[PDB]
Design a protein around this ligand. Sequence first.
Ligand SMILES: Nc1ncnc2c1ncn2[C@@H]1O[C@H](COS(=O)(=O)NC(=O)[C@@H](N)Cc2ccc(O)cc2)[C@@H](O)[C@H]1O
Ligand SMILES: Nc1ncnc2c1ncn2[C@@H]1O[C@H](COS(=O)(=O)NC(=O)[C@@H](N)Cc2ccc(O)cc2)[C@@H](O)[C@H]1O
Lengths: 318, 318
Amino acid sequence: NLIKQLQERGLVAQVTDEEALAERLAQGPIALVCGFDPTADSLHLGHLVPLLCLKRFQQAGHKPVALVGGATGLIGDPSFKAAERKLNTEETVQEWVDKIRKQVAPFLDFDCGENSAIAANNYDWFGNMNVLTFLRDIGKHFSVNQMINKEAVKQRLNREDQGISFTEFSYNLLQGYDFACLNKQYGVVLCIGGSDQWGNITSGIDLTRRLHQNQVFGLTVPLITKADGTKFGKTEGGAVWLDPKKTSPYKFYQFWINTADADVYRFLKFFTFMSIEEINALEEEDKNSGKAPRAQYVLAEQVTRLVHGEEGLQAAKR
Amino acid sequence: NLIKQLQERGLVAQVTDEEALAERLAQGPIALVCGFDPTADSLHLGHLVPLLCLKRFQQAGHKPVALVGGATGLIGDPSFKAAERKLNTEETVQEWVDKIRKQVAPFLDFDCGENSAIAANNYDWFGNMNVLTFLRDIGKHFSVNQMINKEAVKQRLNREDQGISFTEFSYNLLQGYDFACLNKQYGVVLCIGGSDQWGNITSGIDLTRRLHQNQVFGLTVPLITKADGTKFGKTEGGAVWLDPKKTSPYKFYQFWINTADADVYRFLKFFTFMSIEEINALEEEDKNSGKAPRAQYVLAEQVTRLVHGEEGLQAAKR
Ligand SMILES: Nc1ncnc2c1ncn2[C@@H]1O[C@H](COS(=O)(=O)NC(=O)[C@@H](N)Cc2ccc(O)cc2)[C@@H](O)[C@H]1O
Ligand SMILES: Nc1ncnc2c1ncn2[C@@H]1O[C@H](COS(=O)(=O)NC(=O)[C@@H](N)Cc2ccc(O)cc2)[C@@H](O)[C@H]1O
């Protein structure tokens, strides 16, 4: 049902147990979660993929849990990161943390009773957790041997040149715990994220099992890349922040207009709520049209509106 | 001077910088430490060797710091251990800790003046420490790459049959910090322990340099064993405790008088305070004297009074 729908949009990289998950979603609504760490004072175009995905689940009747890593942001996810990351002050992360919560809010119905959205922060629990407690209760459930051969950190370990701190090496446990913790108190049985996050989610489904014996689920969406395999979110001036202050609505819309013909269609699937059908209709319509492609105009309008409301769209054009 | 004196009786296995440590010990009295983890309600003969080196250094005028791992004993030191030590309740361990402390107190002088002994417990700084505080303020200084190859745990990894949890894999950072922490509040510049405790010491040396920029040293005593090969401190009823209740003064004295001829002399150098001279005369004497060796008798008289006092001795005689 739903999974298959997302597959049609090409928004599904890997699924831990497609069937069981598919069957579970069927039984009735569930609660899922997606996490975002405070690396900046705003999220960017990349983050909008998973985020928009929660909303997609919500509309299918599920309850989204949007979690900001108030704690993991003090450590740093080393997942597929080639080089160690630098630690940001406790005060700066806080500030950033707050800008994100608020920034994420507008993207989800936080009131419709049943499946109203939930904002969550792991600082809530890791923030005042004794180190010994953490090592004992969670640590005893992780094997360094296998922690070592996880794709998300494998390479940094095997390299007489590269390396990784004990700190970021532990990152895995905290996100892993977050799952079990969000499951214990909210019934969250699904965690979604971009491909890179897989390993982190994996550890999460495992801890949740050995701590509460609950079959939990994981589902990742591919990391969206420009067709010409360049970057994304990044341009000549930097990341396409969602924060109007960092990227004007006018500039934001101009961005989508400039999409390549080999992307615009996929991008309409990843960023808009257009019936996979009409998107194909639009493609076909554009192909046989001796006219210019209108897909970009669509894409630009839809996203600029999702991210900035009619106000921002009105601005985008003046 | 002192370093070489301890070598005379083979109580030194390694030293971080013999030359410099030698020069430093000469400059004047220093603060040194040795730690003992609560893994039972009592210590055994193996623990005595190191403990005795602390009293040695003290007689030489230095300040002994006797630490008890109220926190480490909750994590489990994996050093050269074959299988994962299991966790003990917080309840049990604190109970063992008191025991070990009080048991330890008699062996060191707690009021000779400037070099009076200090009782220490790392639960003091780990019991109330945030995990995020730990992982970043300390973790950030440990390379998983270098951690994986450290001898004390190269075993557990690089093996199919074995394994190590994230918990015990973290032990190194705790003892490493204990050194730094001790160096900052007592100016402790020396950490002595058994051969197996080396790597743990090293890591302390570095963190101390890395966190305070001070040259700190480490020296390990050889792991005393029976020349015949078999494990030390073991019997039919197992380990020989220092707790009269676990091992009566009588049984204790008997264990000593039963010492093998190839061990008895070394044992006099390790477990007693006889000068290397008289211990050598004794060996010589025993050599060409139609009588039975009296070193056994001596050794038992000494160690028995050391560990149980005049009462304990007179008791091993009835
Ligand atoms: N270009 C992109 N396309 C698709 N997805 C993308 C993307 N760029 C980022 N993302 C995804 O959207 C999120 C972006 O935030 S993130 O900083 O990368 N998140 C992280 O690093 C996670 N460790 C955060 C986290 C997740 C769960 C927790 O319980 C705690 C923390 C991630 O799930 C990432 O996989
Ligand atoms: N048979 C033996 N011969 C000589 N020395 C021996 C011995 N058996 C044990 N020892 C030494 O005497 C001590 C015995 O206690 S122990 O439980 O093994 N100690 C430990 O495991 C350390 N991790 C304790 C510790 C040390 C320093 C800290 O800052 C914190 C904790 C260690 O220094 C050990 O190396």
